[PDB]
């Protein structure tokens, strides 16, 4: 019956800048409201206890505040230790489930890089088990948004492709994208050009690479 | 003070695992206990809950009438024992404290300490090692410009696998990605690395795949076509 909804989804934030994450209930929750700091890997870690206590061990750059239904964490300005996800959590004593906000996402903002970009054909190996995978690799680009779509034949593929991005790079504050497309082996020499087309707004256009079967 | 976290595996749909967790430091019996969970791309989600004195429970409704939280004030021990499991109960478990009061203002609604987190996966998939397919850098790559290559480690389970390049000596500009769970219920990932165009003159590249569940070693050398 108690909803948090955070934002922003994302916060990006120079190191040194100051932010602010923003997380409202769908009803008065009083001063019972939480904040955690979450980073891949590790437990959840108490940052804020009841709206504005600041749990022990936790730097002054970290501040709670608000009431009611409206509640910011604030950063008074970004460490690289910082990078995380943030959750907000509500409880009360009955009925006695907590609630969760959906997380924000604080991530160091850099300048623009534009993804360096290439396709792999399905190895000779992999063909002679049936199945051909084509990857296509986005290196070293920021923001985080991107768009891979694949073209078989000028055809526009839909439902056969997954793709995975690197969390954000520790020395240049990059992410990385694969997508890899998957057809059966008949499928795959059922056709000749295969492409992939990247849309980034570091790329003056969208770059699409190719080749013959 | 520590909440010390054991149990979690890897089992089939509508299967049992048992998650347990020592109290250290502080008085167990005083506090109630919670188990929270996140799932792969989604938010912290709530469990369950037992009172300090084990008198009183509660349930999320994606839980209820199949897990079964308990507490052990003799042995000040708590438990989620996970029954008809499903693959969307797939997640990292986490058991948590109450927060303190402290003479009125503070509250017992947060949870101030958390286990290190432990992961149970549902799946129908059996034990399955990797292949390990190269990707070779392109005819096109030439000096002066950025060549990139890999691994692509297909169709295995369950996680993880782990790789490195050149038995560790090579660091710099490897992205290793996240799996992707394939329709087939197995795993996939690319290991890549780029590299200047003009080392591919000189500089063997080998991806080393290990996947310890199915006891899988693959050393991949990775060469111009």
């Known amino acids: 019956e108690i909803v948090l909804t955070q934002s922003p989804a994302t916060l990006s934030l120079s190191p040194g800048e100051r932010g602010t994450l923003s997380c409202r209930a769908s009803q008065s929750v009083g001063t019972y409201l939480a904040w955690y700091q979450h980073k891949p890997g590790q437990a959840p870690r108490p940052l804020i206890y009841?709206?504005?206590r600041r749990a022990t061990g936790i730097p002054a750059r970290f501040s709670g505040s608000g009431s009611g239904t409206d509640f910011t964490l604030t950063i008074s300005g970004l460490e690289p230790e910082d990078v995380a996800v943030y959750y907000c959590?509500?409880?009360?004593?009955?009925?006695?489930?907590?609630?969760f906000g959906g997380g924000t996402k604080v991530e160091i903002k850099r300048t623009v890089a534009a993804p360096s970009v290439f396709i792999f054909p399905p190895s000779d190996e992999q063909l002679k088990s049936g199945t051909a995978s084509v990857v296509c690799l986005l290196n070293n680009f920021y923001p985080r948004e991107a768009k891979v779509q694949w073209k078989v034949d000028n055809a526009l593929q839909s439902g056969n492709s997954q793709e995975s991005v690197t969390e954000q790079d520790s020395k240049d504050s990059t992410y990385s994208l694969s997508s890899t497309l998957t057809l059966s082996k008949a499928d795959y020499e059922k056709h000749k050009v295969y492409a992939c087309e990247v849309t980034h707004q570091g790329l003056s256009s969208p770059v699409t690479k190719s080749f013959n079967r | 003070a520590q909440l010390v976290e054991s149990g979690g595996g890897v089992v089939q749909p509508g299967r049992s695992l048992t998650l347990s967790c020592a109290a250290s430091?502080?008085?167990?019996?005083?506090?109630?206990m919670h188990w929270v969970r996140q799932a792969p791309g989604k938010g912290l989600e709530w469990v369950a809950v037992?009172?300090?004195?084990?008198?009183?429970?509660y349930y999320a409704d994606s839980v209820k009438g199949r897990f079964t939280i308990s507490r052990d004030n003799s042995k000040n021990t708590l438990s989620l024992q996970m029954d008809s499991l499903r693959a969307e109960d797939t997640a990292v478990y986490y058991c948590a404290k109450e927060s303190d009061s402290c003479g009125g203002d503070c509250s017992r609604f947060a949870f101030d300490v958390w286990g290190h987190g432990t992961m149970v996966t549902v799946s129908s998939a059996s034990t399955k090692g990797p292949s390990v397919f190269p990707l070779a850098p392109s005819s096109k790559s030439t000096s002066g410009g950025t060549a990139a290559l890999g691994c692509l480690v297909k169709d295995y389970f369950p996680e993880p696998v782990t790789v490195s390049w050149n038995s560790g000596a090579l660091t710099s500009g490897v992205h290793t990605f996240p799996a992707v769970l394939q329709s087939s219920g197995l795993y996939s990932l690319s290991s890549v690395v780029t590299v200047p165009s003009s080392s591919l003159g000189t500089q063997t590249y080998i991806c080393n795949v290990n996947h310890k569940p199915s006891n899988t070693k693959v050393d991949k050398r990775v060469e111009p076509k």
């Open positions: 959590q509500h409880r009360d004593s009955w009925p006695p489930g907590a609630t």
């Open positions: 037992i009172a300090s004195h084990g008198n009183v429970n």
């Open positions: 430091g502080f008085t167990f019996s005083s506090h109630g």
């Open positions: 009841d709206a504005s």
